[PDB]
Amino acid sequence: GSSGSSGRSIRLPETIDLGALYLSMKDTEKGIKELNLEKDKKIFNHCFTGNCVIDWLVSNQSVRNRQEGLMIASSLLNEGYLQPAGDMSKSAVDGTAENPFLDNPDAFYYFPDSGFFCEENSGPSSG
Secondary structure, three states: OOOOOOOOOOOOOOOOOHHHHHHHHHOOOOOOOOEEEEEOOEEEEEEEEHHHHHHHHHHOOOOOOHHHHHHHHHHHHHHOOOEEEOHHHHHHHHOOOOOOOOOOOOOEEEOOOOOOOEEEOOOOOOO
């Protein structure tokens, strides 16, 4: 255990700790549910959509509304708690945007701990 906060103002909710939050999402029943979708000829396993993440925070009484979860969800991607999956969010976390999160149902995300494995789905060719 080690504490010692510093600074004039605090953007993030001092009453919360990203680290502790990410743990709640790791839960099977008290965490964010994942799925198996295929994009850009690639089936990402153990991947969840954006919206799901945002809501998951609201339902857990972590935020007041979606927008509110935008910060918590965005920070998770800045620290590493969340990993982008798809040229969609990927282009964001790389682009010049205060928040890498897209709070969109088309944006996928995976945990750095969850057994994430991407499989390239080949296509039917001729000859």
